């Protein structure tokens, strides 16, 4: 039912189908499916405006793992967890995301685009 909700793009309806799911393991799996498909569909507002609760830690773990997993330029998951932190008033936590991603840029990248971005991240935190 959830995946069909995805197929015809009823995102709120998919969210409700997900909230229906009892098992936390399948909840995490379908959460990963949801995040991947929404990212590829450029449906970002969905991810934030989701009012998750008690699934916040599942989403946090998923997004941080994918941040470990993703390219810095072709993927924005650190910024997504950022905006999540804002959406949940997470001052210290959004700062942590920014400084961390600035460190990651300092490691991976030595380009001027990087330079702009490390400055952005350290400053933001």
């Amino acid at each position: 039912i959830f995946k069909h909700h995805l197929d015809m793009g009823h995102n709120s309806q998919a969210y409700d189908a997900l909230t229906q799911i009892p098992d936390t393991s399948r909840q995490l799996d379908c959460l990963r499916q949801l995040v991947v498909v929404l990212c590829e569909r450029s449906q970002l507002q969905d991810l934030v405006e989701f009012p998750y609760v008690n699934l916040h830690n599942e989403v946090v773990g998923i997004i941080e793992s994918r941040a470990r997993a993703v390219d810095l330029m072709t993927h924005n998951y650190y910024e997504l967890l950022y905006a999540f932190h804002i959406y949940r008033h997470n001052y210290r936590k959004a700062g942590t995301v920014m400084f961390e991603y600035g460190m990651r840029l300092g490691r991976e990248v030595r380009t001027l685009r990087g330079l702009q971005k490390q400055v952005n991240s350290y400053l933001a935190c």
Binding site: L44, Q45, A83
Partner: protein, 108 residues
């Protein structure tokens, strides 16, 4: 602004801050100017635009901290003004989340 050309407003403001205009008692007003741009409930500015905007915001912030004294501040206005600073940057960062989600969805 009174006729609501916010884009050129931002252009002029960015130009004048990167010009670093007006004395210390008036970079007060330079800082003060950003409030309606904060008040934007709908924006058309680029993510890079927001970048340089906030860049210069805290750039001038540190600069104002030091213009007062090279390691201190002594102006009577700063304290409560600093409070406004925190609330305004609060609103800023929330609108930054808003602008970035819009811009990312703008690529849809």
């Amino acid at each position: 602004y009174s006729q609501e050309q916010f884009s050129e407003a931002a252009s002029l403001l960015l130009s004048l801050m990167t010009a670093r205009i007006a004395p210390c008692s008036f970079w007060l007003t330079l800082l003060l100017d950003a409030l309606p741009l904060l008040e934007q409930k709908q924006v058309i500015f680029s993510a890079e635009q927001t970048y340089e905007l906030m860049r210069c915001l805290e750039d001038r912030m540190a600069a104002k901290l030091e213009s007062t004294s090279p390691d201190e501040i002594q102006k009577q206005d700063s304290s409560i003004d600093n409070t406004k600073v925190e609330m305004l940057r609060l609103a800023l960062a929330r609108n930054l989340a808003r602008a970035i989600v819009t811009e990312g969805a703008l690529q849809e």
